[PDB]
């Protein structure tokens, strides 16, 4: 009467613009983007990982 198995799973993300199978990512913030189009509206306010402690 005891168990402890963690269903090994992976993380899947989708374009943060249209939410579709991202073919490429931003060479800055590394965001999911299908085509340049979706990347356009992004680049505008593309905010990469700011220097210093942010996430961890």
- C-alpha 50/C-alpha 35 separation (Å) is 25
Site pattern 2..41 for Zn ion (x: CB under 5 A)? -------------x-xx-------x-xx----x---x---
- C-alpha 30/C-alpha 39 separation (Å) is 11
Q: How many residues bind Zn ion (CB under 5 A)?
A: 9
Residue 33 belongs to what H/E stretch?
strand 32-33
**Residue 49 CB, nearest distance to Zn ion (Å)?**
10
Using CB under 5 A, list all residues that contact Zn ion.
15, 17-18, 26, 28-29, 34, 38, 46
């Amino acid at each position: 009467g005891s168990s402890g198995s963690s269903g090994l799973k992976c993380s899947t993300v989708v374009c943060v613009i249209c939410l579709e199978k991202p073919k490429y990512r931003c060479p800055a913030c590394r965001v999911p983007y299908c085509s340049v189009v979706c990347f356009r509206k992004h680049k505008e306010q593309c905010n990469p990982e700011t220097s210093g402690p942010s996430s961890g």
